[PDB]
């Protein structure tokens, strides 16, 4: 396993903790993504952060407006929060 | 550091090995991304894989057609290759 493969395995495992592992297509609901962000990005998000901030982030991620985000959307968010994307501006 | 933060740090470090660390905006050229994929995803890509396959992947990732991909585009690719995205179909 390369470092890249190990890192992806860890990111998938965190996604699995909050999503299902038994669903046909693994997705996070809005409340599940909020719990994930506050627990895993606790120095950028906290349970003190505005719930409106988290809600607006989810609405922009949930492009199809079904109330769920998939793994690809989730990791795009994490990568953008970490290496602060200029697309945010 | 959470598991998610550690995994992102590792993915950023791999990106840095092939991109610059001194450029204003860190990007990978086409040849740099190809080297990264063959070294870090060696059971999905190999130096035996068609160079045309890698070239078509880069052209679809390089959305602005400038010959470079950024970190967000790169990680979208890695996440799609790992958890095989149905968007590929
Ligand atoms: Mg959705
Ligand atoms: Mg480009």
> For residue A46, which of A55, A33, A35 has the smallest C-alpha distance?
A35
Measured between alpha carbons, how far is A67 from A59 in angstroms, rounded to an integer? 8
- Burial of A40 (C-beta count, 10 Å sphere; 0-12/13-18/19+): buried
Q: What tokens does A59 get? A: 């609405």
Measured between alpha carbons, how far is A35 from A49 in angstroms, rounded to an integer? 12
B17 near B43, Cβ under 8 Å? Answer: no
Q: What tokens does B43 get? A: 């059971």
Which ligand has the nearest atom to the CA of A58?
A: 1
Residue of B nearest to A10 (CA): B7
- Give this entry's resolution in angstroms: 1.6
Please, what is the end-to-end C-alpha distance for chain B in angstroms?
Answer: 36
Architecture of domain A3-17+26-88: Orthogonal Bundle (1.10)
> For residue A78, which of A57, A59, A63 has the smallest C-alpha distance?
A57
Cβ atoms < 10 Å from Cβ of A44: 13
Measured between alpha carbons, how far is B17 from B23 in angstroms, rounded to an integer? 13
Please name the member of A6, A13, A75 whose beta carbon is closest to the beta carbon of B79: A75
**Of the options 3.40.50.1110, 3.40.250.10, 1.10.238.10, 3.40.50.720, the CATH number for the domain spanning B26-88:** 1.10.238.10
Q: Provide DSSP, A14-36.
A: HHHHHS-SSSSS-EEEHHHHHHH
Q: Which of A72, A84, A85, A89 should we substitute to test contact with B (largest number of B Cβ atoms within 10 Å)?
A: A72
N residues, chain B: 89
| Chain A residues near residue B78 by CB distance under 8 angstroms | 4, 8
- Burial of A1 (C-beta count, 10 Å sphere; 0-12/13-18/19+): exposed
| Chain B residues near residue A42 by CB distance under 8 angstroms | 2
User: Number of helices and strands (H, E) in chain A?
Assistant: 4, 2
Backbone breaks in chain B (C–N > 2.5 Å) follow which residues?
A: none
Q: Provide DSSP, B4-65.
A: HHHHHHHHHHHHHHHS-SSSSS-EEEHHHHHHHHHHHSTTT--TTS-HHHHHHHHHHH-TT-
The contacts of residue B76 (CB under 8 Å, 6+ apart) are: A72, A75, A76, A79, B61
Please answer yes or no on whether A78 and B4 come within 8 Å at the CB atom.
yes
Which ligand has the nearest atom to the CA of A68?
A: 1
- For chain A, give every domain's residue range: 3-17+26-88
Q: What share of chain A is helix, strand, coil (3-state, %, to 5)?
A: 60, 5, 35
The contacts of residue A37 (CB under 8 Å, 6+ apart) are: A44, A45, A54
């Amino acid at each position: 396993m390369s470092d890249t493969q190990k890192a992806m395995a860890m990111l998938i495992a965190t996604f699995h903790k909050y999503s299902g592992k038994e669903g046909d297509k693994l997705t996070l609901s809005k409340g599940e993504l909020k719990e994930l962000l506050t627990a895993e990005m606790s120095d950028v998000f906290g349970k003190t952060t505005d719930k409106a901030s988290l809600d607006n982030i989810f609405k922009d991620l949930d492009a199809n407006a079904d109330g769920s985000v998939d793994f690809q959307e989730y990791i795009t968010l994490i990568a953008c929060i970490t290496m602060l994307c200029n697309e945010f501006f």
